[PDB]
Write a protein that binds this ligand. Sequence first.
Ligand SMILES: C[S@@+](CC[C@H](N)C(=O)[O-])C[C@H]1O[C@@H](n2cnc3c(N)ncnc32)[C@H](O)[C@@H]1O
Ligand SMILES: Cc1ccc(C(=O)O)c(N)c1
Length: 256
Amino acid sequence: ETLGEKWKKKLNQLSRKEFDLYKKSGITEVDRTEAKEGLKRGETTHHAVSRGSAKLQWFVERNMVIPEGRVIDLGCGRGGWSYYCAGLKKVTEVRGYTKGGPGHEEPVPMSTYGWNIVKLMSGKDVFYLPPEKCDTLLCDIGESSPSPTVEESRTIRVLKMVEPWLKNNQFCIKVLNPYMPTVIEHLERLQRKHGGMLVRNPLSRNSTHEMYWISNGTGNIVSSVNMVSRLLLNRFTMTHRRPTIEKDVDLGAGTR
Ligand SMILES: C[S@@+](CC[C@H](N)C(=O)[O-])C[C@H]1O[C@@H](n2cnc3c(N)ncnc32)[C@H](O)[C@@H]1O
Ligand SMILES: Cc1ccc(C(=O)O)c(N)c1
Protein backbone atom coordinates (compact mmCIF):
# COMPACT_ATOMS: atom_id res chain seq x y z
CA GLU A 1 0.00 0.00 0.00
CA THR A 2 1.31 3.44 -1.02
CA LEU A 3 1.67 6.43 1.29
CA GLY A 4 -1.04 8.09 -0.88
CA GLU A 5 -3.44 5.27 -0.04
CA LYS A 6 -2.72 5.76 3.72
CA TRP A 7 -3.42 9.47 3.29
CA LYS A 8 -6.73 8.77 1.51
CA LYS A 9 -7.83 6.27 4.18
CA LYS A 10 -7.13 8.78 6.96
CA LEU A 11 -8.89 11.58 5.01
CA ASN A 12 -11.97 9.32 4.72
CA GLN A 13 -11.99 8.74 8.51
CA LEU A 14 -12.34 12.47 9.32
CA SER A 15 -15.62 13.92 10.55
CA ARG A 16 -16.96 16.87 8.52
CA LYS A 17 -15.66 19.26 11.23
CA GLU A 18 -12.14 17.64 11.13
CA PHE A 19 -12.18 17.58 7.30
CA ASP A 20 -13.07 21.30 7.11
CA LEU A 21 -10.21 22.19 9.52
CA TYR A 22 -7.73 19.93 7.67
CA LYS A 23 -8.47 20.87 4.04
CA LYS A 24 -6.90 24.36 4.20
CA SER A 25 -4.34 23.73 7.00
CA GLY A 26 -1.04 25.29 5.96
CA ILE A 27 -2.05 25.76 2.31
CA THR A 28 -1.76 29.01 0.36
CA GLU A 29 -4.86 30.76 -0.92
CA VAL A 30 -5.75 34.00 -2.64
CA ASP A 31 -8.18 36.42 -0.99
CA ARG A 32 -11.29 36.15 -3.21
CA THR A 33 -13.38 38.71 -1.24
CA GLU A 34 -13.16 41.52 -3.80
CA ALA A 35 -13.66 39.29 -6.86
CA LYS A 36 -16.67 37.50 -5.28
CA GLU A 37 -18.31 40.85 -4.46
CA GLY A 38 -17.66 42.20 -7.99
CA LEU A 39 -18.86 39.01 -9.72
CA LYS A 40 -22.09 39.05 -7.61
CA ARG A 41 -22.74 42.59 -8.98
CA GLY A 42 -22.08 41.43 -12.58
CA GLU A 43 -18.79 43.37 -12.92
CA THR A 44 -16.96 42.12 -16.06
CA THR A 45 -13.54 43.76 -15.70
CA HIS A 46 -10.51 43.01 -13.46
CA HIS A 47 -11.94 40.03 -11.59
CA ALA A 48 -10.82 36.43 -12.08
CA VAL A 49 -13.94 34.23 -12.39
CA SER A 50 -12.55 31.52 -10.06
CA ARG A 51 -9.47 30.65 -7.98
CA GLY A 52 -8.17 28.97 -11.16
CA SER A 53 -6.62 32.12 -12.62
CA ALA A 54 -4.25 32.47 -9.64
CA LYS A 55 -3.64 28.68 -9.64
CA LEU A 56 -2.43 28.60 -13.26
CA GLN A 57 -0.62 31.96 -12.78
CA TRP A 58 1.47 30.24 -10.06
CA PHE A 59 2.88 27.80 -12.63
CA VAL A 60 3.26 30.38 -15.43
CA GLU A 61 5.15 32.89 -13.28
CA ARG A 62 7.62 30.07 -12.44
CA ASN A 63 8.01 29.24 -16.20
CA MET A 64 6.72 25.69 -15.62
CA VAL A 65 4.24 26.25 -18.49
CA ILE A 66 4.59 29.27 -20.81
CA PRO A 67 1.31 29.74 -22.73
CA GLU A 68 1.69 30.86 -26.33
CA GLY A 69 -0.05 30.81 -29.70
CA ARG A 70 -3.31 28.85 -29.80
CA VAL A 71 -4.22 27.73 -26.26
CA ILE A 72 -6.69 24.85 -25.67
CA ASP A 73 -8.23 24.79 -22.20
CA LEU A 74 -9.90 21.41 -21.45
CA GLY A 75 -12.44 21.46 -18.65
CA CYS A 76 -12.49 25.26 -18.59
CA GLY A 77 -15.46 25.53 -16.20
CA ARG A 78 -16.10 29.22 -15.42
CA GLY A 79 -12.97 30.06 -17.49
CA GLY A 80 -10.28 31.06 -14.95
CA TRP A 81 -7.40 29.55 -16.93
CA SER A 82 -8.69 30.84 -20.27
CA TYR A 83 -9.18 34.46 -19.16
CA TYR A 84 -5.76 34.48 -17.46
CA CYS A 85 -4.08 33.14 -20.69
CA ALA A 86 -5.93 35.71 -22.80
CA GLY A 87 -3.82 38.51 -21.30
CA LEU A 88 -0.39 36.86 -21.84
CA LYS A 89 1.89 38.46 -24.41
CA LYS A 90 2.64 35.30 -26.47
CA VAL A 91 -0.99 34.07 -26.57
CA THR A 92 -2.95 34.67 -29.78
CA GLU A 93 -6.15 32.56 -29.31
CA VAL A 94 -7.85 30.77 -26.41
CA ARG A 95 -10.42 27.97 -26.94
CA GLY A 96 -12.02 26.53 -23.77
CA TYR A 97 -14.20 23.41 -23.64
CA THR A 98 -16.31 22.35 -20.66
CA LYS A 99 -19.16 19.96 -19.97
CA GLY A 100 -21.58 22.31 -18.23
CA GLY A 101 -25.14 21.30 -17.41
CA PRO A 102 -26.35 20.05 -14.03
CA GLY A 103 -23.50 19.54 -11.56
CA HIS A 104 -20.97 21.40 -13.74
CA GLU A 105 -19.70 25.01 -14.05
CA GLU A 106 -20.88 27.17 -16.97
CA PRO A 107 -18.48 29.63 -18.63
CA VAL A 108 -18.83 33.15 -17.19
CA PRO A 109 -18.72 35.91 -19.84
CA MET A 110 -16.11 38.51 -18.97
CA SER A 111 -14.48 41.61 -20.40
CA THR A 112 -11.02 41.13 -18.81
CA TYR A 113 -7.95 41.95 -20.96
CA GLY A 114 -7.90 39.87 -24.13
CA TRP A 115 -11.54 38.68 -23.81
CA ASN A 116 -11.95 39.07 -27.59
CA ILE A 117 -9.49 36.22 -28.31
CA VAL A 118 -11.36 33.80 -26.02
CA LYS A 119 -14.13 31.38 -27.03
CA LEU A 120 -15.58 29.20 -24.23
CA MET A 121 -17.78 26.34 -25.38
CA SER A 122 -20.00 24.57 -22.88
CA GLY A 123 -22.02 21.39 -23.48
CA LYS A 124 -18.76 19.69 -24.56
CA ASP A 125 -17.57 16.42 -23.03
CA VAL A 126 -13.84 16.37 -23.86
CA PHE A 127 -13.82 12.52 -23.85
CA TYR A 128 -15.68 12.71 -27.23
CA LEU A 129 -13.70 15.61 -28.72
CA PRO A 130 -11.23 14.83 -31.57
CA PRO A 131 -7.84 16.54 -30.93
CA GLU A 132 -7.08 19.97 -32.42
CA LYS A 133 -3.76 21.60 -33.38
CA CYS A 134 -2.61 23.91 -30.56
CA ASP A 135 0.54 25.49 -29.18
CA THR A 136 -0.48 25.13 -25.54
CA LEU A 137 -2.58 22.29 -24.11
CA LEU A 138 -4.20 22.90 -20.70
CA CYS A 139 -6.40 20.42 -18.84
CA ASP A 140 -7.90 20.84 -15.37
CA ILE A 141 -10.18 17.78 -15.30
CA GLY A 142 -10.37 15.32 -12.49
CA GLU A 143 -13.33 15.01 -10.15
CA SER A 144 -12.47 13.95 -6.54
CA SER A 145 -14.14 10.88 -5.10
CA PRO A 146 -13.95 9.22 -1.68
CA SER A 147 -13.04 6.03 -3.67
CA PRO A 148 -9.33 6.05 -4.75
CA THR A 149 -10.13 3.31 -7.37
CA VAL A 150 -12.74 5.68 -8.90
CA GLU A 151 -10.06 8.43 -8.84
CA GLU A 152 -7.49 6.06 -10.39
CA SER A 153 -9.90 5.34 -13.31
CA ARG A 154 -10.67 9.04 -13.75
CA THR A 155 -6.96 9.96 -13.73
CA ILE A 156 -5.92 7.26 -16.29
CA ARG A 157 -8.85 8.29 -18.52
CA VAL A 158 -7.62 11.92 -18.47
CA LEU A 159 -3.99 10.79 -19.22
CA LYS A 160 -5.13 8.70 -22.20
CA MET A 161 -7.44 11.49 -23.52
CA VAL A 162 -4.83 14.28 -23.41
CA GLU A 163 -1.98 12.42 -25.11
CA PRO A 164 -3.21 12.96 -28.74
CA TRP A 165 -3.40 16.74 -28.06
CA LEU A 166 0.38 16.72 -27.16
CA LYS A 167 2.59 17.49 -30.14
CA ASN A 168 5.81 19.17 -28.90
CA ASN A 169 3.60 21.92 -27.29
CA GLN A 170 3.48 23.68 -23.92
CA PHE A 171 1.21 21.86 -21.45
CA CYS A 172 -0.20 21.83 -17.91
CA ILE A 173 -2.42 18.86 -17.04
CA LYS A 174 -4.09 18.03 -13.73
CA VAL A 175 -3.31 14.54 -12.38
CA LEU A 176 -6.10 13.96 -9.83
CA ASN A 177 -4.64 10.83 -8.18
CA PRO A 178 -0.95 10.52 -8.99
CA TYR A 179 -0.07 7.88 -6.32
CA MET A 180 -1.71 4.70 -7.64
CA PRO A 181 0.99 2.39 -9.21
CA THR A 182 -0.98 2.12 -12.51
CA VAL A 183 -1.03 5.94 -12.74
CA ILE A 184 2.72 6.18 -11.99
CA GLU A 185 3.34 3.67 -14.87
CA HIS A 186 1.40 5.91 -17.33
CA LEU A 187 3.06 9.10 -16.06
CA GLU A 188 6.53 7.57 -16.45
CA ARG A 189 5.71 6.51 -20.02
CA LEU A 190 4.26 9.96 -20.80
CA GLN A 191 7.33 11.73 -19.31
CA ARG A 192 9.69 9.51 -21.39
CA LYS A 193 7.84 10.58 -24.58
CA HIS A 194 6.77 14.22 -23.85
CA GLY A 195 9.12 15.28 -21.06
CA GLY A 196 8.05 17.60 -18.27
CA MET A 197 7.56 16.97 -14.57
CA LEU A 198 4.79 16.56 -11.95
CA VAL A 199 4.47 19.55 -9.57
CA ARG A 200 2.42 20.17 -6.43
CA ASN A 201 0.78 23.63 -6.41
CA PRO A 202 0.74 25.32 -2.92
CA LEU A 203 -2.78 26.63 -3.74
CA SER A 204 -4.16 23.10 -3.84
CA ARG A 205 -6.23 22.01 -0.81
CA ASN A 206 -4.92 19.18 1.46
CA SER A 207 -8.18 17.30 0.68
CA THR A 208 -6.84 16.47 -2.82
CA HIS A 209 -3.54 14.77 -3.77
CA GLU A 210 -3.67 16.45 -7.20
CA MET A 211 -0.41 17.34 -8.91
CA TYR A 212 0.08 18.97 -12.36
CA TRP A 213 2.11 17.56 -15.22
CA ILE A 214 3.84 20.64 -16.66
CA SER A 215 6.01 20.71 -19.77
CA ASN A 216 9.01 22.77 -18.56
CA GLY A 217 10.79 20.73 -15.95
CA THR A 218 12.52 17.46 -15.20
CA GLY A 219 12.65 15.19 -12.22
CA ASN A 220 11.70 11.94 -10.58
CA ILE A 221 7.93 11.44 -10.57
CA VAL A 222 7.89 8.78 -7.85
CA SER A 223 9.99 10.97 -5.49
CA SER A 224 7.74 14.00 -6.09
CA VAL A 225 4.60 11.97 -5.45
CA ASN A 226 5.85 10.40 -2.20
CA MET A 227 7.04 13.86 -1.00
CA VAL A 228 3.42 15.10 -1.39
CA SER A 229 1.97 12.03 0.36
CA ARG A 230 4.32 12.57 3.31
CA LEU A 231 3.52 16.31 3.38
CA LEU A 232 -0.23 15.68 3.41
CA LEU A 233 0.02 12.85 5.95
CA ASN A 234 2.02 15.07 8.29
CA ARG A 235 -0.62 17.83 7.99
CA PHE A 236 -3.05 15.51 9.90
CA THR A 237 -0.70 15.59 12.98
CA MET A 238 -0.99 19.21 14.03
CA THR A 239 -3.76 21.69 14.93
CA HIS A 240 -5.12 23.79 12.02
CA ARG A 241 -2.64 26.25 10.54
CA ARG A 242 -4.63 29.11 8.95
CA PRO A 243 -3.79 29.32 5.22
CA THR A 244 -1.13 31.71 3.91
CA ILE A 245 -3.16 34.54 2.29
CA GLU A 246 -2.09 36.10 -0.95
CA LYS A 247 -3.51 38.75 -3.23
CA ASP A 248 -5.79 37.59 -6.06
CA VAL A 249 -5.00 38.45 -9.72
CA ASP A 250 -6.21 41.56 -11.54
CA LEU A 251 -6.96 40.55 -15.15
CA GLY A 252 -7.58 44.16 -16.27
CA ALA A 253 -9.74 45.19 -19.24
CA GLY A 254 -9.62 45.83 -22.98
CA THR A 255 -9.20 44.00 -26.26
CA ARG A 256 -6.13 42.83 -28.15
C1 LIG B 1 -11.34 22.13 -11.65
S1 LIG B 1 -12.59 22.71 -12.74
C2 LIG B 1 -11.72 23.82 -13.85
C3 LIG B 1 -11.45 25.19 -13.17
C4 LIG B 1 -10.85 26.11 -14.24
N1 LIG B 1 -9.46 25.68 -14.56
C5 LIG B 1 -10.87 27.59 -13.82
O1 LIG B 1 -9.76 28.18 -13.76
O2 LIG B 1 -11.98 28.12 -13.57
C6 LIG B 1 -12.73 21.27 -13.82
C7 LIG B 1 -13.88 21.52 -14.83
O3 LIG B 1 -13.89 20.38 -15.71
C8 LIG B 1 -15.24 20.15 -16.06
N2 LIG B 1 -15.35 18.80 -16.60
C9 LIG B 1 -15.40 17.62 -15.91
N3 LIG B 1 -15.47 16.55 -16.66
C10 LIG B 1 -15.49 17.06 -17.95
C11 LIG B 1 -15.57 16.44 -19.22
N4 LIG B 1 -15.79 15.12 -19.38
N5 LIG B 1 -15.54 17.24 -20.31
C12 LIG B 1 -15.46 18.57 -20.14
N6 LIG B 1 -15.42 19.27 -19.00
C13 LIG B 1 -15.43 18.45 -17.93
C14 LIG B 1 -16.02 20.37 -14.77
O4 LIG B 1 -17.36 20.70 -15.08
C15 LIG B 1 -15.27 21.58 -14.16
O5 LIG B 1 -15.88 22.83 -14.45
C1 LIG C 1 -23.86 25.76 -24.70
C2 LIG C 1 -24.50 24.55 -24.03
C3 LIG C 1 -25.12 23.56 -24.83
C4 LIG C 1 -25.69 22.45 -24.20
C5 LIG C 1 -25.62 22.33 -22.79
C6 LIG C 1 -26.24 21.14 -22.21
O1 LIG C 1 -25.80 20.70 -21.01
O2 LIG C 1 -27.17 20.50 -22.75
C7 LIG C 1 -24.97 23.32 -21.98
N1 LIG C 1 -24.86 23.25 -20.59
C8 LIG C 1 -24.42 24.45 -22.65
